[PDB]
Design an enzyme around this catalytic site. Structure first.
Site, PDB file in Angstrom:
ATOM      1  CG  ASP A  39       9.658  13.438 -27.420  1.00 42.08           C
ATOM      2  OD1 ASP A  39      10.345  13.968 -28.311  1.00 42.08           O
ATOM      3  OD2 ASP A  39      10.172  12.799 -26.482  1.00 42.08           O
ATOM      4  CG  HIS A  69      13.888  13.103 -28.822  1.00 44.69           C
ATOM      5  ND1 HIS A  69      12.872  13.198 -27.893  1.00 44.69           N
ATOM      6  CD2 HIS A  69      15.020  12.818 -28.125  1.00 44.69           C
ATOM      7  CE1 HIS A  69      13.355  12.946 -26.685  1.00 44.69           C
ATOM      8  NE2 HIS A  69      14.651  12.702 -26.803  1.00 44.69           N
ATOM      9  CG  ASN A 161      20.323  12.477 -21.072  1.00 50.11           C
ATOM     10  OD1 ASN A 161      19.952  11.402 -20.570  1.00 50.11           O
ATOM     11  ND2 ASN A 161      19.722  13.018 -22.106  1.00 50.11           N
ATOM     12  N   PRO A 175       8.266  13.271  -6.863  1.00 47.86           N
ATOM     13  CG  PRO A 175       8.696  13.649  -4.623  1.00 47.86           C
ATOM     14  CD  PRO A 175       8.251  14.360  -5.874  1.00 47.86           C
ATOM     15  CB  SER A 224      15.278  10.552 -24.378  1.00 46.57           C
ATOM     16  OG  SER A 224      15.224  11.894 -23.953  1.00 46.57           O
TER      17      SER A 224
END
Length: 278
Positions: A39, A69, A161, A175, A224
């Site tokens: 991140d 974040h 989002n 997957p 997130s």
């Protein structure tokens, strides 16, 4: 163990019903596991991390989280007050700049970094990676996430989002990793959450209180925020010996609260992460 007046999402993951505020969990609390938060970084000095967080890699001039974040996501994984797995070890990998942006080549490098770097860490109960990031479909990004999973890391990724089918986003559409949608405190799909057959699970994602930079806290929303609930849950369940990195997404889906969410499109799983702690 019981944590009173917990954030709603922590209470939700240990409950068969919405509308409670105590988080119940086995006191092992993810001890002996490790979670990589890939991140904007982690403010490891935050008192909420208790010395259990550290930066291990950056691709930028600093390892500091100048955004917040990554610190918020890390807090939902493993902070003392806001975290699912309150005794896990947290490792930060800064693939996103302080505006929250990053090139796919850097993100891929960060995933391959974790697959190797876990061999430099002590994680006897297992290793998780939380990826609260994504963009448009990329086979190379999906392959990187697949390699990380194959290497023996439970990979949890945000669905995105866009209120759209996650098949068109990466690494959400891979997957073999665990793709996480978001719900709210009334058990509704979050208004922004992506959906689709590629989702594996939902977690709390609307109005999630966690750590922030400058030693602070705040409530924000997104897939997130749902993703680190699932990553911390995987670490917690691995410490208990209930599952493994290769099987934890399936185990979480097997043991989830089923059919409790509203506004789930036909063809998307109606499964909400649940620790089944009694």
């Amino acid at each position: 163990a019981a944590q009173t007046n917990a954030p709603w999402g922590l209470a939700r993951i240990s409950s068969t019903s919405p509308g409670t505020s105590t988080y119940y969990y086995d006191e092992s609390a993810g001890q002996g596991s490790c979670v990589y938060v890939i991140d904007t970084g982690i403010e490891a000095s935050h008192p909420e991390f208790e010395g259990r967080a550290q930066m291990v890699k950056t691709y930028y001039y600093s390892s500091r989280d100048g955004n917040g974040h990554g610190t918020h996501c890390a807090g939902t994984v493993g902070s003392r007050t806001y975290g699912v797995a309150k005794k896990t070890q947290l490792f930060g990998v800064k693939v996103l700049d302080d505006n929250g942006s990053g090139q796919y080549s850097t993100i891929i490098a960060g995933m391959d970094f974790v697959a190797s770097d876990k061999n430099n860490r002590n994680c006897p109960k297992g290793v998780v990676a939380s990826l609260s990031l994504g963009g448009g479909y990329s086979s190379s990004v999906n392959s990187a996430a697949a390699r990380l999973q194959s290497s023996g890391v439970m990979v949890a990724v945000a669905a995105g989002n866009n209120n759209a089918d996650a098949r068109n986003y990466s690494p959400a559409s891979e997957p073999s990793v665990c793709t996480v949608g978001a719900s709210d405190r009334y058990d509704r799909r979050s208004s922004f959450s992506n959906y689709g057959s590629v989702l594996d699970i939902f977690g709390p994602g609307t109005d999630i209180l966690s750590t922030w930079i400058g030693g602070s806290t705040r409530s924000i929303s997104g897939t997130s925020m749902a993703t680190p609930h699932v990553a911390g849950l995987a670490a917690y369940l691995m410490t208990l010996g209930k599952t493994t990195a290769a099987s934890a997404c399936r185990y979480i889906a097997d043991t989830a609260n089923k059919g409790d969410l509203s506004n789930i499109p036909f063809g998307t799983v109606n499964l909400l992460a649940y620790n089944n702690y009694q």
